[PDB]
Symmetry: D2
Subunit: 260 residues, 4 copies
């Protein structure tokens, strides 16, 4: 016996999944038996990484160069993906960026950068996929990758902020957006939810400032940064049919940071 | 391939696991392979029901009459469970009650009735198990059934409250308690999280004021109360080793009610 | 010119209004012109302190020994206050207690002690006043002293809990109870709101572990504990007719602690 | 006696201060004795309205045409205001817009519009003022008009969404942005807080179908929309020295809407 979730013959779209957390979602869903599309921006080795993933788990994988902030480019990639692997069963909007500068120095360009990917993009992908499912009367489940930063401001030092007000605020927008979409699409048997990670280990971490990184680790009850691997379980559940009564919600994987 | 969580050769305790949502948890974990200890208060058929579950899923089950509001009975019951089916791998503190009366009419007795089970009962159950795990240097995961009522006040009619202020406030207390316990037990490898259901269909529903029931359903995005089975997936994940970075959190299964 | 709130010829009840934050409230409403009924449990100088306030601010005051955890004593006291200083215009349900012990060591007796004052006591006080208002067909405003502890767990050291799980959970209950009461009494012109302080300097502060005190102030954006007087402006606003559209809310005065 | 807040000899800037809620703020702070700098986009009668306010309350006022989404113009306008009425004592970043359209039909243009004002516009204004205060070592208080929409999704009909996902999501961003800014400027003696109204009766709100507004009011505990004046008390408190321990917070004036 055992609790089993299977995505065999099912395709899940996953943005920014050629690396970082996206790659964790990539493998996880695949390992669960899913065909997977890795949307990326300019990763030189994205097509490779994808291929490697698909051959390791015995599933159908294909990468796609695509700036989620671009309406038409996203509306096509989605139409295409649905021809290479349709019909679509689930989506995981994870592509995200950030700017770190004192608030007084943030420029319009910075705002645009962050919000076009971290907020407009998420919206863009969801609408695209939703219209499709709506058009063909297909049900679906969407998982938006937010952050605990939707609730708190991160620290870079004791009582000292990690300056990225556009990032944190874009994540708040993100988590709220999930509710707005779930609200309109619920009647169409379409579910939308947010997964919000805490401090996670990624390649960039080993190259960040150590005084900072340590401090960030000093106030986590679990006493450590997460591994991207620790974010996928909640996603599978959210995508699975076990979650028919779950929509418009935000699910934190913060290691207890939000307790303090 | 697929996503699997197995509780084979593991024991899970479920309070109020003989009926309602608790039984759903019981059957769900029993189907995942765990042996189950069902704690109940006074249901005449609790023993029969529990025995059957064990026969249906081919697992070891046992029922224990144990008022969760009683310190010593709970301590003794946890010890007996550890002897009968130990070691205990997880706990679902699900037992809960309510009192529906206009706020002005609520008594101190009503307060104790609700809080002794919904808050102290949760604390007591969690503490007994945690103490055992601490003594035996064992890791564990605890899931507490709270409610979306921790965040909002329920309605019985348009703009009209379902009058049960001790219920909603006790659930808010419960969800906070989860954070408090999670903070102290984190270093001991013990995780504590809250699962908060929205409106769920149980045997009591069919006997409630239709008008109130219809009204409550008329404002849920998914347009219906949940079936108890819809709460189990999240519970299983929280109990599983995949949820290693999840503690002190509250996970809603409200069908979008919190959207509004 | 200026913004002025006058409570001349109005009476406010303050539970725990003889010392600590409660006394700050008493003094503030008195300075605003209100007559004040001070409820206390056993302080030997409660009468003297209350008399001094009246003389200092030229208002009528009276102290009432009244255990808020007891239904009938509260009912009788509210009736006497109405007879002595009626009509009652507002209430600050401020009396509260705590128990600091590791969670595993907390008892049912500790639970009763904290919850009978912090939750039942608040409910009971609110209920007695509201019943009088409803009977006499009078309008009113109630402010409950909760705590930022309703949202977070406090620290006694870096990544180390200030162990008082019944306190934090009781405050979460309190803040939710405010919503429940506000929901039922809204149509009768009775508003109920929670005021939630962060770390505050009181007489007990000067006698607490200095290491703990320093740690707690080290992670507050404003770099310091608040003075009791800094809690009064919000209370006066909530009690006034400027707050006609404010009910069911929780108003934090945390110095930015909740930002992190 | 009485509680009195005086802004005599102080200058407050109010964006969108020529009509709706912004005009209520303007009048409220003028009545408190503050000089007012009113920022507007293109209103044809803003000058007349602003002047009338000054003459009515015997304070100095001036209107400034200034698109808050424009970096340079805002910077220039702030410089001019400082020269004209400086030092600036407070800022109410109130300007805001919305787009009501089914989520599937929303465009990038719509995104840029809403977010340039509701988020960047707020950031831009706060930053222009903050930089000035820092350069001159001046303390100050900032209030940002967000919305309860930061937490929930509005309805247009029973279980039917008021489709404007970009609005609600931008407000969530806004309230988070307040925390972000408050975190960085706390050590500088600058406080930042969000004031989040429920349904308010302004000309703009009145533009949507009365059927929709009747539905909305039917589910507000206070059973009506607020008048803009009902938002002013909290703003005055936040801008005042009584709010010295209040920063990074969100203060709802929702009529109890968030109770449900
Ligand atoms: N790292 C953390 O501790 C943490 C915590 C909470 C939340 N998150 C969120 O989780 C996500 C991934 O985090 P991460 O640290 O792995 O990020 P990362 O290492 O910076 O990876 C982000 C990925 O997004 C893609 N991307 C960037 N801009 C894009 C655009 N315009 N269109 C399409 N794709 C774009 C990039 O693909 P290309 O490689 O091809 O350029 C990049 O791989 C982000 O949303 C992040 O905000 C991260
Ligand atoms: N029903 C809903 O729509 C709903 C929604 C959200 C959350 N919840 C929460 O989910 C949990 C279960 O709900 P439910 O609807 O299944 O409840 P139920 O149908 O009322 O069953 C609750 C069970 O708890 C047990 N119990 C009560 N007091 C106890 C005590 N002192 N000691 C030991 N056991 C005790 C009872 O055992 P006996 O069978 O022996 O009487 C009862 O079976 C509760 O915490 C509830 O508040 C319910
Ligand atoms: N201190 C803080 O940093 C802090 C922070 C956040 C929130 N708060 C909250 O603010 C409130 C006041 O705090 P505080 O520090 O001023 O408290 P305190 O110094 O401990 O005084 C509390 C008062 O409550 C009264 N009281 C206790 N039990 C009572 C009962 N059964 N019946 C009637 N009165 C009773 C006592 O009256 P007697 O004088 O006769 O003993 C006592 O004066 C509490 O709700 C507390 O939880 C405090
Ligand atoms: N009304 C409600 O029920 C309600 C509820 C919650 C929150 N709010 C929020 O409260 C605020 C005001 O609401 P309202 O109903 O009074 O709105 P309104 O009647 O639409 O007024 C908004 C004002 O903002 C100004 N504005 C717009 N874009 C601007 C820009 N780019 N630069 C400078 N000024 C700009 C406009 O000036 P011009 O006059 O020259 O056009 C306009 O007067 C908004 O932030 C809104 O989101 C309103
Ligand atoms: Ni926090
Ligand atoms: Ni709500």
């Amino acid at each position: 016996p055992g609790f089993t979730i299977s995505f065999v013959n099912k395709t899940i779209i996953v943005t920014g999944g050629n690396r970082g957390i996206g790659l964790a979602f990539t493998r996880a869903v695949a390992a669960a038996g899913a065909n997977v599309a890795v949307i990326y921006r300019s990763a030189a080795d994205a097509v490779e990484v994808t291929e490697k993933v698909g051959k390791e788990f015995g599933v159908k994988t294909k990468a796609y160069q695509c700036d989620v902030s671009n309406t038409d480019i996203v509306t096509k990639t989605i139409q295409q993906i649905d021809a290479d692997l349709g019909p679509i069963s689930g989506l995981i909007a994870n592509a995200g960026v950030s700017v770190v500068k004192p608030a007084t120095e943030l420029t319009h360009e910075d705002f645009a950068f962050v919000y076009d990917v971290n907020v407009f993009g998420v919206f863009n992908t969801c609408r695209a996929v939703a219209k499709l499912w709506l058009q063909k009367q297909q049900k679906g489940s969407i998982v938006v990758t937010s952050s605990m930063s939707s609730q708190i401001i991160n620290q870079s030092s004791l009582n000292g902020s990690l300056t990225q007000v556009f990032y944190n605020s874009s994540k708040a927008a993100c988590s709220n957006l999930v509710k707005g979409l779930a609200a309109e699409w619920a009647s169409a048997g379409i579910r939308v939810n947010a997964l919000s990670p805490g401090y996670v280990n990624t390649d960039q971490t080993a190259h960040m400032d150590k005084k900072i990184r340590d401090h960030q680790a000093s106030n986590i009850p679990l006493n450590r940064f997460a591994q991207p691997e620790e974010m996928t379980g909640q996603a599978i559940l959210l995508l699975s049919d076990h979650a028919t009564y779950m929509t418009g919600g935000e699910y934190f994987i913060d290691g207890g940071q939000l307790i303090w």
